[model samples]
Target: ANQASVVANQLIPINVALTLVMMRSEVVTPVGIPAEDIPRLVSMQVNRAVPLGTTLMPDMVKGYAA
Candidate 1:
């Protein structure tokens, strides 16, 4: 992709989807939203990979408030 890596023979584009982390969002230990932490979903995925609840990051998902 435009932000991923490219190797000598690694031309396979990695499928990626933005993980929403809102004000009341909850990830895990090292990745959990406190109380109105981030304004929007910056670059915090993988940690929030698996599907659980609804999304509220913005454009990626049209859900609760930011």
Candidate 2:
């Protein structure tokens, strides 16, 4: 079973999909959405269903008005 699967349109738990890892700042790369933006996803809902372990991107979620 995968921990990151978005089962339905609901508020996702912070630990469900993401893991905060500490790394050297020099080793950080501008690849995917950084951890700083993680807070933005806190109360947001997924735009659609997502597969297991899918690396979260900005387009995957939208504001949840609730």
Candidate 3:
């Protein structure tokens, strides 16, 4: 499929704003995040800056557990 992924291209910086991570689903693959989980992602702050078009994975962000 050639369609662009919903969250694939949005760049997120360290301490990104909540609005930037919003998406309001898919069968999320192992490790890769899904739009449905934005709730948790929203609560978390990014540990580092991500360049445009980068996949925002869990490692890129951090939560209380980090």
- Report the number of the highest-lDDT candidate: 3
* Residue range 4-66, candidate 1, lDDT tens digits: 211112111122333332223444333222324343433433223223343332233223234
Regions more than 4 Å wrong, model 1: 1-32, 54-66
Candidate 2 lDDT, 1-62, residue by residue in tens: 11232222333344344322311112122243443455445545556554544444556556
Query: Backbone clashes in each candidate structure, one number apiece?
Result: 0, 0, 0
Model 3 lDDT-worst window of ten: 1-10
Residue 10 CA displacement from its true place in model 1, Å: 29
Q: Each candidate's lDDT (Cα)?
A: 0.29, 0.39, 0.50
lDDT (10s digit) by residue, model 3, range 3-65:
222253455667774343343233333434545566565556667776654555656666523
Clashing residue pairs in candidate 2 (N, C-alpha, C atoms within 3 angstroms): none
Candidate 2 ranges with C-alpha deviation above 4 Å: 1-30, 64-66
**lDDT, residue 13, model 1:** 19
TM-score of each: 0.23, 0.41, 0.51
Task: Identify the leading candidate in terms of TM-score.
Answer: 3
Between candidates 1 and 2, name the one with more favorable lDDT. Answer: 2
Q: Which scores better on TM-score, 1 or 3? A: 3
